Amino acid sequence: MTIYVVTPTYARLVQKAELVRLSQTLSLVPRLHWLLVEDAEGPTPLVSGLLAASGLLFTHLVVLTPWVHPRGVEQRNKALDWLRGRGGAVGGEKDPPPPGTQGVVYFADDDNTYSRELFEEMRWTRGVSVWPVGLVGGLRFEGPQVQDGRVVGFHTAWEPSRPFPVDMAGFAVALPLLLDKPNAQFDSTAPRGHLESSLLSHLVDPKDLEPRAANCTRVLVWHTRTEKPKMKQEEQLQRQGRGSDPAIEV
């Protein structure tokens, strides 16, 4: 069962650092195909270079992002388009899996923290699977309430009106189910935190969710965020004509 990890990424100071630790974590997982989608005009040397050197099975994708400020929407839908045979690769495996292929799709932002155990949990998804997510929604962890092996509620707080009050990193979807539901995609016009539900509503009813991670008692992924680097000194040095050598990638 191959796991397809959809990861939208964009250039900023901590980008390479984020892709380095993430790609290194992904190299621990067998049967994993990384769909890295750059939010850029075209493929960048930085990302192309990191992928080629990663040693991972991957497909490089690119799409530009054109009030609620959703992040990575277009990039995620681009990965979905590719999976549905609408092309778009610029590197790596050019052809998507043919229909009938078994597999699971997981949307992994480039700044979260993922334990290798998480991937074995989602590898057996029939429709849509779920598990708790740490340090998200303003909670220690947000996650499905499980009873008798079934989801009967949710431990959440923010925007409780959400049919699926779970984070992007808190679920995975069966590849066959995605192809069998062509209208399933992320809605960029969706309110602040209803992005997840905009995709999932086309796939299942929350009652049909497959609880994983020891019936949602284990937190195997964390919604970590990196601090924006301090650059006051870099700014001053540049004015003096001695800024950090730009020919050295960071």
Added chain:
Amino acid sequence: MTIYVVTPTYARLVQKAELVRLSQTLSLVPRLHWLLVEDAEGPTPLVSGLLAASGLLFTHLVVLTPHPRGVEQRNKALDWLRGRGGAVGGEKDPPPPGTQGVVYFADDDNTYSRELFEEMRWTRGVSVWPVGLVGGLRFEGPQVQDGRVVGFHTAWERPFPVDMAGFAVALPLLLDKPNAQFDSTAPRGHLESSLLSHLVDPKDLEPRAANCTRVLVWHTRTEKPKMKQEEQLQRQGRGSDPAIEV
């Protein structure tokens, strides 16, 4: 050649996450021995459990520090390497005297590429390489000329203007200098120097990373999670189950 990674850690919301992605990166490095020292009153089940399930060669140490942080913890790892014992888990026996190896001080929130470790494995005395996103710069790094450290690309004021993550020390040199340790009273920018002045002259530093032309380690920091909601649910008697580890 074994690499001894000394990592001080402490309990806070992101600790487990930090330790998870750090240990996963380390499991990609051969001949590596992890010296994880907790800044706590005793071994925490969280860390003990993470170490046991990591499949890494490690030694677990503890020491509480009631201003530069993680200092006492790093010094205890050094004490252990000097046969002064102090382990509470993992490999209790330190490397025998005259053992070859290199010591690297890796904070638990930085980002380290696998290549970094292969660069430091050749350390004779003390080696150096650039560090990204640190000191207010895209990167700080030694200035190399003819394969010799002739200066330092830095902004903040120091005999050794390099971050904790930008150097490694040969094990034999550390044993040879029994007084070489971090000064817990040394202010932030002088912590690295308090140790290195006991070991070598900055002009004897061995430049790595293609003569310091590549950034293989980043000084990333993790945002503190907002917990307003947790506090609200706590008032209502339904906070995140304390029995579910995060």
